[PDB]
Amino acid sequence: MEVTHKQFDLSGFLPDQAPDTLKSGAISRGFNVKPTILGWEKSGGFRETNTAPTNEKDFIFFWSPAIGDNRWFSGGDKTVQQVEGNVVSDVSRTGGYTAGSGRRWNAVNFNGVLLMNNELDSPQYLAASGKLEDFPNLPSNVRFRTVAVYKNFILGLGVNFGSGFLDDEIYWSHQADPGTMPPNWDYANAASDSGRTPLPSEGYCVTSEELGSMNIVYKSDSIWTMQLIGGQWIFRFENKFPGQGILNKKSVVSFEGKHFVVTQKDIIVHDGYQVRSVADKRVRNFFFTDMNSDYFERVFVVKDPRVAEVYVFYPSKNSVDGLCDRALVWNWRDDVWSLLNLRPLKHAAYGYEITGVSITWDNFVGGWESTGLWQADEDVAKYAPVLHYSFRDVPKLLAPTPQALFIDEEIEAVWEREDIVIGSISRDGVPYQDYERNKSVSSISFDVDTTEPFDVYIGYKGSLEDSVEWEFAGTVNPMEDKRLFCLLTAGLFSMRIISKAQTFILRSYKITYEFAGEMWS
Amino acid sequence: MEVTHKQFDLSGFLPDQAPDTLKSGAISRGFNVKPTILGWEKSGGFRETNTAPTNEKDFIFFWSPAIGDNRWFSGGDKTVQQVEGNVVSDVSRTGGYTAGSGRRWNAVNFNGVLLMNNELDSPQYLAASGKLEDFPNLPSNVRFRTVAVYKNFILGLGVNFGSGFLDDEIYWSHQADPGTMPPNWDYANAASDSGRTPLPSEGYCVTSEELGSMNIVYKSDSIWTMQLIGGQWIFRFENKFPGQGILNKKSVVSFEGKHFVVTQKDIIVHDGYQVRSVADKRVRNFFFTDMNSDYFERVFVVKDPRVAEVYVFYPSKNSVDGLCDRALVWNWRDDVWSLLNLRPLKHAAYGYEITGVSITWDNFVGGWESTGLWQADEDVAKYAPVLHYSFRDVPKLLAPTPQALFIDEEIEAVWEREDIVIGSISRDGVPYQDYERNKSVSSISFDVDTTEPFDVYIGYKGSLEDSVEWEFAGTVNPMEDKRLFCLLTAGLFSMRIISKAQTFILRSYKITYEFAGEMWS
Amino acid sequence: MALETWDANSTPATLNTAWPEATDPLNKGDDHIRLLKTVVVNFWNKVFD
Amino acid sequence: MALETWDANSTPATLNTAWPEATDPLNKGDDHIRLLKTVVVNFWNKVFDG
Amino acid sequence: MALETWDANSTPATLNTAWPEATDPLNKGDDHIRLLKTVVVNFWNKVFD
Amino acid sequence: MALETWDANSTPATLNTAWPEATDPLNKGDDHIRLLKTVVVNFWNKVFD
Amino acid sequence: MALETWDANSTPATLNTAWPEATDPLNKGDDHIRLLKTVVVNFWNKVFDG
Predict the structure, then answer these.
(1) DSSP A135-171
(2) Which of B199, B206, B119 is nearest to B160 (CA)?
(3) What is the CA radius of gyration of chain G?
(4) Which of A215, A343, B6, B401 could bond to A226 as cystine, CB 3.0-4.6 Å?
(5) B381: distance to nearest CA of chain A, Å?
(6) Which pairing describes strands A12-13 and A26-27: parallel, antiparallel, or unpaired?
(7) What b-and-e string marks burial along B119-157, b requiring 16 or more CB atoms within 10 Å of the CB?
């Protein structure tokens, strides 16, 4: 008899459930593939942009007061540079920042001004002059672990007063007027309490950066809200959702009036009204079992502007330099999870890209074998930004491309499912697993859309307690044929597909099998 | 014919329903196993930490003003000590507290200050000096059974005025400024009524400690709310949910904007809007039938930070010293109940753990047979805290570990189901129990993920009125074989599995049987 | 995670790259080395003979 | 990451003989064992039956 | 000892399976790992370019 | 809870450890002792004969 | 808990002869009967058919 498992049911990467029972359209391992309504297709590659800071990088921010004013900031270690057009210029303080910065650079736009805090030196602002200068009317010693803004007040978290660090926050400023830095810090006179507040909890007040309209403050171990009420007490405080913290200062983002947060114990989306634990039976265990944790500060969260996706970059155990080698991609239009296995990466951000000189039949320098797309890339989507990636061993910043060639080199994809459902079929037409008889497999038939060839591996295990053992089934070239023949008997079966090609879309597949007795061990 | 009962349906420990009818994936007895989406797996063991107070313990609290300031408090009898790093220092009042304390120590953070009440001596606060000192501006004789905080007012419950105890509460304080102890108790002048309030009910106002935003006050036999309205009358009072009390001063905790409370008659979760009786047809009867009750004050409730669970430690009938020998674990991500059978325990709390010296190939002192995990434990989850447990006969505090070896010694697990469903099968494919015919059992086949061996016991009873009688079926080693053969005829059957191994995951099992006449007695 | 089920003639087929997991026990360390040794010897015997 | 820089598709050529030195931390030992597994499998599939 | 005598020119022939042993000291774990690395490299070199 | 169904040849198999429950009646006390006596005698007769 | 300290897996070695004294409270008698049951079963399974 035959069993037909069809993809495009939008189940996706489910590494937390038992492989034996995950539904067709679900896989247990693999990378560089993402689930769509078409099947299990392959993700694109990377091109290069003109931006190049030639410093240590480690952090990139975008500044653009108006259209065409494409200014790129690259905050490295001990040096902060500005990249505009084809020139790179220094914008750092006269006293270069202390060593170790670049692991801790944060930036924010305060009604048109840019502020950067390294936590290892005094907070800075970019002055009209064009050089980052230290803070205007605040005493020098005080330090904030992070710098945020709520309307007209610039907030600071984890404050050191010259005596030590208290893990509490200051409502710094006295209502700076738009376009101007704040008047003064004086928690005693004009703004009355312009700070000094406990926010008691077991945690340390990591990032209070995001605002839903009312700033939400995230402490490790708890969530709190903030509202502007004015008077003797400027702000109000409540404890909302105790027990849900935040992992890192870079693990928060907003979309469609909601927030995606990577808590130390979970990944959740919330709107102040309530919470929802996304990732609970899919990916929760895997993320915390494959993260190193020596580095937990190296994770960050980015939002793709062109397509609805959330990227969670994180280090793996296999990482030796502590950078980031993998990513968990979440699609919020339709809840699916993906995994990407990519080269070591420092940081990523999105911003507008300048155009390029028109390519003409006369000026092109390559044979038909050279890379490119008919549209010069900048022209594509001149309406929206494009992610830029700093890659450590690459001289220039990169951007995604539909073409899958990386710079020129090839990207491999792996598609693996463990313990496929082979057994009887319900009267409703759905198959279910049979754990009590051995099975014998004759052929595997593929329904794909790609034309280029791929490899197929077949795994077999005697029973649940055993481990999988792999056999090389062969190579499948869809245009010539779409079937593969192998004779095996075992308790359970698993299949792995490895491809290095520009296009690979998988729609479905079926297996022909027979029952072969009973299972013993 | 064959009947296949599959686990991982998330039913869990259901000791209140009739065993004959509880569904597959449900058990009636057993301990040290918890239900997951993978099956019925085995819980881990305990390691040791560096913290050791060497006093009577009986109470542990965590204090940490900033990151790295890991301060552990151990409030024993007649002596209160502070454990920091590798040193233990005394912080007690000049007059050591009276005997019997340690059964009644409560602590709370009031905008950055720590307050402890033993009820047997005057309330204390930890002074700037570093010694717990008695209360600052309150008359000496007055005593509160418990000490709580609501914003800027420190509340007291069950107040004695020098004449006797009234079981009523005082809005002590006159709005202490953050970081400062309260100005004065004067229910007559500046704060007007700074207390003296009846809260009439049949009960005694146990703990009003928790706040949902508006403090909730729990009296035995009733629930009441509190709100700050100001003016001549500082606070407002309403009776919400009469008839639902609280068992103990240590039986409340908050999570995700809700409260888990162990009432004297039920276990419930509430949000002020309404109530929900969790535990009603599962575990309600068992908890109150297996608690001793001579000791009802010895129970407490703890929340696990790493994973979503609520622990309800309580004494059993078999306890001879009155300590706590068992626990009811509740998972709120997916409603299941578990039971843990563990050594006598005094108290438990969670807090950050300091690091340790790096282990190197040169410095390690043991053979491959020694205990440990590849990651030194502190490094694991440096992002979150870890439960610490005081165990009475153990010199040092302990922490959970994935490894299952306790200190070195082994932990046993028992998996028991009574009156398995053996009978006809519905056209929908679900089995149902048959109470009118005898049955004959031939074999039992297991689907497990563990590789180590286990014991299996088979029980048989003639009919419902009889008791179970146990037979030793044999030992099952999954790698060699997964089947077991025994020939028995009886009215009803039950099975028990006992394992002492690091890993044990049970996915499903099936039974082969035949009908053997009719049931008589 | 603990170990690939294995015997004297296991070969490179029975190797799970991800198996020596981060939180996995030290006591299983000896076994992992030995699985690797057996695998290498058999592969050499197969293709150099 | 004081080990041979390694990646998912690396050949045994990448492996270095002396890097797991004695003073090295035990924690990165798993990284060395798994590095060894990945390389052996890759070499095998490429030449033996590939 | 339970550590094979080895030199930088060791072939896959040198290893004896069963050598990392349950009783063996952990201090020799790195050495055993390093032997495996020398053995593997030489064959990829002898048989492949 | 009251008592394991029992007779002269019950043996240690018919013992429910949890059966003498806390709120259970005193009048059932005599029976529980006797179940234990019968069980011990039969076990001794079985294994010392 | 003025009885032999006992636990779920204890052998009969643990039991003490004189502890249930006359002055002792009737309430802890159940604890003594159940202690006796647990021990007998354990000894039996360990040696008789174990």
Answers:
(1) -SSS-SS-EEEEEEEETTEEEEEEEE-SS-B-S-BB-
(2) B119
(3) 12
(4) A215
(5) 6
(6) parallel
(7) bebbbbbbeeeeebbebeebeeebbbbbbbbbebbbbbb
Residue G31 is nearest to which of B318, B322, B341, comparing CB atoms?
Answer: B318
* Residues A332, A354 contacting (CB under 8 angstroms): no
Percentage helix, strand, coil for chain E under 3-state DSSP, each rounded to 5: 50, 0, 45
DSSP B345-384: E-EEEEE-----PPPBTTT---BTTS--BSS-GGGTTTTS
H or E stretch including A284? Answer: helix A284-289
Tokens matching residue A82: 């500005």
Do residue D34 and residue C18 have CB atoms under 8 angstroms apart? Answer: yes
Q: Where are the alpha helices (DSSP H) in chain E?
A: 29-47
Beta bridge partners of A218: A207, A223
Helical segments of F1-49, H only: 29-47
Judged by DSSP in three states, B222 sits in: strand
Q: Cβ of E26 and B362 within 8 Å? A: no
> Quick check: D26 and B362 CB within 8 A?
no
Q: Determine if residue D22 is left, alpha or beta; phi over 0 gives left, psi from -120 to 50 gives alpha, anything else beta.
A: alpha
Which of E12, E20, E22 has the CB atom closest to C40's CB atom?
E12
Q: Residue G5: which residues within 8 A CB-CB, separation 6 or more?
A: B320, B321, G14
Q: Do D6 and A318 touch (CB under 8 A)?
A: yes
Contact B368 E30 (CB under 8 A): no
Q: Which chains touch G (3 or more CB pairs under 8 A)?
A: B, F
- CB within 8 A of C7, min separation 6: which ones? none
C29 to chain B, any CB pair closer than 8 A? The answer is yes
* DSSP β-bridge partners for residue A48: A398
* Residue B211 CA: distances (Å) to CA of A240, A242, B82, B214, B270: 11, 11, 28, 6, 12
- The token pair that represents A74 in the structure block: 């690259």
Q: Where are the alpha helices (DSSP H) in chain G?
A: 29-43
How many Å apart are CA B250 and CA B146, to the nearest integer?
11
Contact yes or no for D44/D12 (Cβ under 8 A): no
Cα D26 from Cα E33, distance rounded (Å): 12
DSSP string of A450-489?
A: --S-EEEEEEEESSTTS--EEEEEEEE-TTT--EEEEEEE
